[PDB]
Amino acid sequence: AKYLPFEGLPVADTGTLTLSFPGISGKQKSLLLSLSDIILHIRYTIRS
């Protein structure tokens, strides 16, 4: 009933999608060191 996040964004827009990790040197240092790659599940909707 409410809007989902990132709903209705035009998929062909000139936006900036930023994934920010707080604490690069803190407790998330080994987790960032063990990161393989970044993968997004962008689901979009085409409508006529």
């Binding site: 990132f6 900036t16 930023t18 994934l19 040197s25 990161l35 970044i38 689901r43 979009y44 909707t45």
Partner: protein
């Protein structure tokens, strides 16, 4: 209200719900301008907490204690993944990481 409701009921069609899984390492490798390998740039920027990666709007940057990875959505060619005979209002439904 009844005018707007009848217009919504007359102009509402079903969908075309397309999930597109995007790997950022592929985009960072096929950047064609200061392209890089993501798994090496992350350990470079973690063990040296100063640098960035690639150009602006399409790469990593360390800001204080906040490693942030950027991406420009126009450079992913999502609206041209299908023919345009199926609709132009191609809006993002939902994103998960």
């Amino acid at each position: 209200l009844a005018q707007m409701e009848k217009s919504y009921l007359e102009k509402d069609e079903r969908a075309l719900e397309v999930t597109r899984t995007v790997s950022l390492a592929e985009v960072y490798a096929g950047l064609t301008e200061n392209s890089f390998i993501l798994k090496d740039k992350v350990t470079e920027l973690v063990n040296a907490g100063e640098g960035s990666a690639g150009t602006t709007l399409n790469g990593l940057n360390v800001e204080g204690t906040q490693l942030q990875a950027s991406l420009k959505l126009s450079d992913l060619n999502i609206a041209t993944d299908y023919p345009d005979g199926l609709g132009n209002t191609r809006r993002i439904k939902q994103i998960s990481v």
